[PDB]
């Protein structure tokens, strides 16, 4: 199931929905989590915190089913709103979702 991108809420951006599964069985080998490293508590120039992908394992789920790259801002993790949450916040969000066999992350390009 590929990912899709629909018009943002401002009509000037594209917000797609990315679904990742921590099955750990990508074509590469086993991986570890889903396929990309994310960061939290990244205070932007707007005045709010968010999440950013530090890196993506070429071949992992996040790459094949997600299709993103380090630098993308994920305003949604596991169907939860991250905007406003700091590094410690995201930590709880993701970690809590790290146990789930499926995840839903959204970004903004």
């Amino acid at each position: 199931h590929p990912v899709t991108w629909q018009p943002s809420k401002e009509g000037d951006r594209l917000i797609g929905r990315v679904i990742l599964n921590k099955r750990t069985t990508m074509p590469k080998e086993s991986g570890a989590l889903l396929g990309l490293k994310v960061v939290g508590g990244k205070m932007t120039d707007l005045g709010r915190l968010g999440a950013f992908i530090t890196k993506v394992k070429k071949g992992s789920l996040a790459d094949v089913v997600g299709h993103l790259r380090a630098g993308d801002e994920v305003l949604e993790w596991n169907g939860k709103p991250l905007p406003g949450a700091t590094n410690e916040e995201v930590y709880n969000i993701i970690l809590e979702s790290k146990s789930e066999p499926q995840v839903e992350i959204i970004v903004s390009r």
Binding site: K37, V39, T54, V90, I94
Partner: peptide, 6 residues
């Protein structure tokens, strides 16, 4: 600069 492993 990291945060969580995914």
């Amino acid at each position: 600069e990291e945060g969580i492993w995914a």
